[PDB]
Amino acid sequence: SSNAFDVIELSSQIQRYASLSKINNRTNPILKDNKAKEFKDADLKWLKLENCPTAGDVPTTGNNNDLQDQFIACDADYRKGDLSYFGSQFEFSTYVHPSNPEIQRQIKQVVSYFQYRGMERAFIGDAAGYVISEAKKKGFSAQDYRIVLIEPDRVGYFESNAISYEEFIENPSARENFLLKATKDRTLALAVSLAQTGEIAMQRDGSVAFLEDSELCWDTAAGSAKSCLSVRYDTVGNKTELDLKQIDVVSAKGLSFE
Amino acid sequence: SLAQTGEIAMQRDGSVAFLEDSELCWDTAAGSAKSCLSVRYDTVGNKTELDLKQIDVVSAKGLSFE
Amino acid sequence: SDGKTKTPVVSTYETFQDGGRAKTINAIECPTGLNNRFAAVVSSFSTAGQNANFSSESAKDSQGTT
């Protein structure tokens, strides 16, 4: 009597994990690779703390006198119920970190799958209604919400056929079209994606970095082009350049160079 | 009396100031290494420093000092 | 400076080694797209030839002409 609650709880904890660069003041382990896609197993060992009886992948501060941020309890298991946790598909982009050479990627998109082990495949629509209601109860917009059939891919899985939640519920023609292709080589599953797509605001702690080749500008009465600056990189010279040549004069007080 | 936290968004009028010892960085094409800078204060000497040494070269047009 | 890109000029105090052998000075590392420049200008001198030691900035030892 907690499957609808548990699907959103784990999905939101998976989304929180996806948005953090450091966990317990240490680098996020999922950012420490260079692959464009990685599948994290359904066992959720990767989401449990390292300071657990069985070692997880989440780093600790080291001194356990501080409260260690965690995402799921150590004995937690979500391979239960009509909607059974199946794993999460992470998609990455290459990334530039100022201080961690093992950090080579940042997270592009996370989709967490819940296979339906209900009595009738047709009943996945009801299980979907309870989760979406619990998600909207907790303020989460489910991006591209869909019932899917997934097959193994080179990295993790890929969606052979997908149908919007609206079409599974309001078009019996489309619904039986989908339930038809659900065969033994595919797994019937719910695809839960959270939110946050828009552009990002620069923060007062400086944790947010400018994007590559972006220009910081001032409104000037000079019009355009004469008020901006950027940090450029020379792919051959292997030198970072602080381009102020758009400014006519740079007036400082004290000044030192090397 | 209000104070601002790290989560506060930087405003186009500049009324929100950086936190002390925080670094303004760029995602740069260097691969995995950003090119950051900060305004540091040195209690011994009582002097403010605009540290650009994480960027290899600073390229200006006109340039004046005191 | 007048359309040409420049680095700040940097200066060294130099004397020749004993033996009348040529003076070797390492060229500064120039940023990509700039070329090395050099200029030597006279500070102190005499006609002592080899009978002198001018390596001190504060005094000049001149023992005369051979």
Numbering used by the authors:
A (entry chain A): 34 to 291
B (entry chain C): 226 to 291
C (entry chain B): 292 to 357
Study authors write:
The toxin-coregulated pilus (TCP), an operon-encoded type IVb pilus (T4bP), plays a crucial role in this process, which requires an additional secreted protein, TcpF, encoded on the same TCP operon; however, its mechanisms of secretion and function remain elusive. Here, we demonstrated that TcpF interacts with the minor pilin, TcpB, of TCP and elucidated the crystal structures of TcpB alone and in complex with TcpF. The structural analyses reveal how TCP recognizes TcpF and its secretory mechanism via TcpB-dependent pilus elongation and retraction.
To clarify the interaction between TcpB and TcpF, we performed cocrystallization experiments with the TcpB-TcpF complex. The initial phases were solved to a resolution of 4.05 Å by molecular replacement (MR) using the reported TcpF structure and TcpB structure determined here (details below) as search models. The three TcpB molecules formed a trimer in an asymmetric unit. This feature differed from that of the ETEC CofB-CofJ complex, in which minor pilin CofB interacts with the secreted protein CofJ at a 3:1 molar ratio. Every TcpF molecule was a bilobed structure constituting an NTD and a CTD connected by a short linker, with little interaction between them. These CTDs were spatially separated without direct contact. However, the model building of the N-terminal binding region was unsuccessful due to the relatively low resolution of the present x-ray data.
